[PDB]
């Protein structure tokens, strides 16, 4: 394993290591804000490493047009569970990272809020949420 | 203690707690499966102004690395 | 109710800060903030 995480020395300067690597994200995306809020210098380095499409970066990683790429965990985990060859490798398990959740955006003060949350907790409280993960997630090895 | 004396054979318990315990004592062994993926919350009274800013503070701590420092203090630590 | 829930419902407690198990039965009586923890259950063997 090469990269420890966001604290890795590679994220200090690509010139610090002999091979000048490259890593970007989706433009106008949510995670781009996290880079700017935490490390504005990282955004300056990511400025020259920008890409256009999610699978375009996936093609670049397979072809070798990109060294590393930063995106969400659940999305990148599924694309790696069905990939042939499995050349691309995930890093960690959400260990040095946000560890947040997925939610439903409601209008402020919606009266549905109490009813919606009761079902969602009950949905994970009876194993029904577990089966849906089996249907749409595939972890080999 | 009872399972340490080899009187018990299985015991349902939390994940991180038993991870830290196996870190402290090498004889403590866990299983492989990971089920009931939920979270721990802050027990509160009924609706009160001590709810909004509390959850906002929890989110602001999760977004940055303070939870990482807490892990380094107690959870990440090993033997 | 008893324990932490009993002491909180009685008014003697204002806020329970403990590794609480988020579940529907207890959420029906009190409120929660967003979870700070992510984990489940396991089996302890020797």
């Amino acid at each position: 394993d090469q990269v420890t995480g966001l604290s890795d020395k590679k994220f200090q300067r690509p010139h610090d290591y002999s091979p000048p690597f490259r890593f970007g994200t989706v433009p106008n995306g949510s995670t781009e804000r996290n880079i700017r809020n935490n490390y504005p210098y990282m955004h300056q380095y990511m400025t020259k490493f920008n890409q256009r499409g999610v699978e375009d970066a996936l093609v670049s990683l397979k072809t070798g047009k990109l060294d590393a790429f930063i995106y969400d965990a659940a999305v990148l985990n599924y694309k790696a569970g069905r990939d042939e060859g499995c050349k691309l490798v995930t890093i960690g398990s959400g260990y040095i990272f946000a560890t947040t959740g997925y939610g439903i955006a409601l209008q402020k003060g919606s009266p549905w809020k109490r009813q919606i949350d009761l079902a969602l907790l009950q949905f994970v409280g009876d194993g029904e949420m577990e089966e849906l993960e089996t249907l749409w997630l595939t972890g080999i090895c | 203690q009872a399972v340490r004396d080899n009187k018990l054979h299985a015991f349902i318990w939390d994940s991180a707690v038993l991870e830290f315990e196996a870190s402290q004592k090498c004889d403590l062994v866990t299983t492989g499966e990971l089920f009931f993926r939920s979270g721990f919350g802050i027990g509160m009274r009924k609706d009160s102004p001590w709810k909004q800013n509390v959850s906002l503070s929890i989110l602001k701590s999760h977004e940055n690395g303070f939870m990482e420092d807490l892990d380094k203090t107690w959870v990440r630590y090993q033997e | 109710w008893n324990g932490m829930m009993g002491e909180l419902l009685s008014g003697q407690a204002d806020m329970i800060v403990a590794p609480l198990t988020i579940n529907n039965e207890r959420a029906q009586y009190i409120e929660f903030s967003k979870p700070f923890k992510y984990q489940g259950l396991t089996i302890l063997v020797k």
Partner: peptide, 25 residues
Amino acid sequence: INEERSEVVDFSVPFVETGISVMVS
């Protein structure tokens, strides 16, 4: 889920444990 999006709307409870990560070959 971040700050600036929590200012304009309200979220329900989350259901899946997802962070961010870096993909390498």
